[PDB]
Amino acid sequence: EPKFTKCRSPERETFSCHWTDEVHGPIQLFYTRRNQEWKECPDYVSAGENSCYFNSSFTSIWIPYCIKLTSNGGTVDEKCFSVDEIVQPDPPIALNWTLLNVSLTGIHADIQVRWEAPRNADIQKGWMVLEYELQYKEVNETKWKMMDPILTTSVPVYSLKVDKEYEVRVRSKQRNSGNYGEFSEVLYVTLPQM
Amino acid sequence: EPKFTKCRSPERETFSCHWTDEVHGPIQLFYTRRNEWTQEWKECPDYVSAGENSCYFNSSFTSIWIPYCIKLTSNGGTVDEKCFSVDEIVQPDPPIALNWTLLNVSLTGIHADIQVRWEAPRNADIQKGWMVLEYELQYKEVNETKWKMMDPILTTSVPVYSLKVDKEYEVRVRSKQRNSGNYGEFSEVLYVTLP
Amino acid sequence: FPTIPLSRLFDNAMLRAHRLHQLAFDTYQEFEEAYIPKEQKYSFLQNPQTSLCFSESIPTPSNREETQQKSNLELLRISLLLIQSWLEPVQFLRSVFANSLVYGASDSNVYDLLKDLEEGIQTLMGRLEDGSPRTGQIFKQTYSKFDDALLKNYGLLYCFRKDMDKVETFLRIVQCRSVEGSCG
Numbered sequence: 001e002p003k004f005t006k007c008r009s010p011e012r013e014t015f016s017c018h019w020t021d022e023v024h025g026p027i028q029l030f031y032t033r034r035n036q037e038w039k040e041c042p043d044y045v046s047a048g049e050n051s052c053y054f055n056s057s058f059t060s061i062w063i064p065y066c067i068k069l070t071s072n073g074g075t076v077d078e079k080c081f082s083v084d085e086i087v088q089p090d091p092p093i094a095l096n097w098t099l100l101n102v103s104l105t106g107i108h109a110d111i112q113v114r115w116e117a118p119r120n121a122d123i124q125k126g127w128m129v130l131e132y133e134l135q136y137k138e139v140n141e142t143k144w145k146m147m148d149p150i151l152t153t154s155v156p157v158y159s160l161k162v163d164k165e166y167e168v169r170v171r172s173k174q175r176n177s178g179n180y181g182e183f184s185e186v187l188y189v190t191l192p193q194m
Numbered sequence: 195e196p197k198f199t200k201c202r203s204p205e206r207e208t209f210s211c212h213w214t215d216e217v218h219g220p221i222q223l224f225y226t227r228r229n230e231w232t233q234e235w236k237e238c239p240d241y242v243s244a245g246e247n248s249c250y251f252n253s254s255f256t257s258i259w260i261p262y263c264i265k266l267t268s269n270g271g272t273v274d275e276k277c278f279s280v281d282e283i284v285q286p287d288p289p290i291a292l293n294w295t296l297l298n299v300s301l302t303g304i305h306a307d308i309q310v311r312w313e314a315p316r317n318a319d320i321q322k323g324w325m326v327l328e329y330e331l332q333y334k335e336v337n338e339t340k341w342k343m344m345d346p347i348l349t350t351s352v353p354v355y356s357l358k359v360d361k362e363y364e365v366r367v368r369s370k371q372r373n374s375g376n377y378g379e380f381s382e383v384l385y386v387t388l389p
Numbered sequence: 390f391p392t393i394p395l396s397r398l399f400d401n402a403m404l405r406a407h408r409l410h411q412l413a414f415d416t417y418q419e420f421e422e423a424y425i426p427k428e429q430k431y432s433f434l435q436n437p438q439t440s441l442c443f444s445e446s447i448p449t450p451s452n453r454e455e456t457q458q459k460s461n462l463e464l465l466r467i468s469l470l471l472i473q474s475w476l477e478p479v480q481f482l483r484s485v486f487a488n489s490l491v492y493g494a495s496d497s498n499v500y501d502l503l504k505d506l507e508e509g510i511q512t513l514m515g516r517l518e519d520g521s522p523r524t525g526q527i528f529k530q531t532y533s534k535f536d537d538a539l540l541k542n543y544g545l546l547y548c549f550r551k552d553m554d555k556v557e558t559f560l561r562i563v564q565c566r567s568v569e570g571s572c573g
Contacts, residue, residue, distance in 0.1 A: 066390055082393045126407055
């Protein structure tokens, strides 16, 4: 049913909006950088099936935008936002881990998990300053244990039972603005009986 | 023959040039700025204040973004000339009040995580925007040769991870003006003994 | 509709000011230790042919004491005119930036940051109505103009490094006064 879903800016430089209208007439996107006159969607195709891609030239981080989705004249959904409000950065690339050591008891171990920034933050720098939230749980536990949001691409995980299989996933966010992106590919950490 | 060592602005407000004693003739310092210019040479305003073999321009003789030229004279002859600008010569003081806190202990009993914290140098006006400092923490175990260096911190508190309990470490930190080539001297060393 | 708060407004402008200054600094310093000896670094500063910057037509504070006696609309205006003054002259650093190992230094990239930071300061002049009688000097819009080649390029690059340091300082002074809890 012809409503908005998500406008998302992956780096703080571009963005797009999505909706639902995959049979459920012509839907159109309309925008205005608030400062009445609507411009219309610049590129209804680069993001695919039900999208509108606002590129570099069309995206300014100093003004609020508004958008109304017009299904054959009628406005169905409409929404205003600003670009830091819709920053939702790509998950981290290439997680791994290292075995620090095991106890005398042999019951527990200490690992360290590294990851690597999304490619589109490298490119940026001094614009897009990321913070990572690592969470982990046992392969058959239920609630994820979360860790404090760290700015580094490495955090140790302590007290893991040497023969219990584990899942580690980390997600990212811009330093105080926007909200979290999706999670990384989930690492499966398995500790050897040493 | 006397020679210049270093000139240095600590807080981007005052500065001082220092030289070596190598004739005793009288060694004197003469300066000029482009705020006339290279024919309006004036002697060091304050030979005592920054200690011996020094000249010290205070808050009222300093301007940044203006080129200064400096000349040293032994019994009137020149041994060194030197030109620079004060915004180019910032080399801030070391951070003060280095302290720490336990953050986490692994159930293996082998690794701890501490949080180190510190206050900025007392004369660096970070509070009203005339400076912005960047810190560099360094730690190593007191029986290790290589110092682990940290990737420049913008905040006065850092956590350092996977410290060993049964060892003792020493930490040492230095300030920098954001976007400049300096780093001051390190701070007083902090020995962290775990417990 | 949403207002973007002054807090974020200032915060993004300092990302830009700081990247512009970090770019001018690193690019200048690698050019210097490859092509300028101290012999020449001094000869340059010494002699006005190679010392004055076209940006100097704009009155700017020189020390802390003068800087803090300026208003928020004056510091933002001096800041705007210094950025507007580099919009065309960064073209002449194309040849120096193309051979720079500094990621990010390119006439097209640096012009983009100067153009974005320019919109920001204008956005900040529209929010910050903080008393200032709008008059004469500084409210005359003299964006500064610009009239061997190794020293030509070192002069442009010496003045970019500095004017970016001025823009970065001047925006931080007004963020520190406008947005409490920014600096402490």
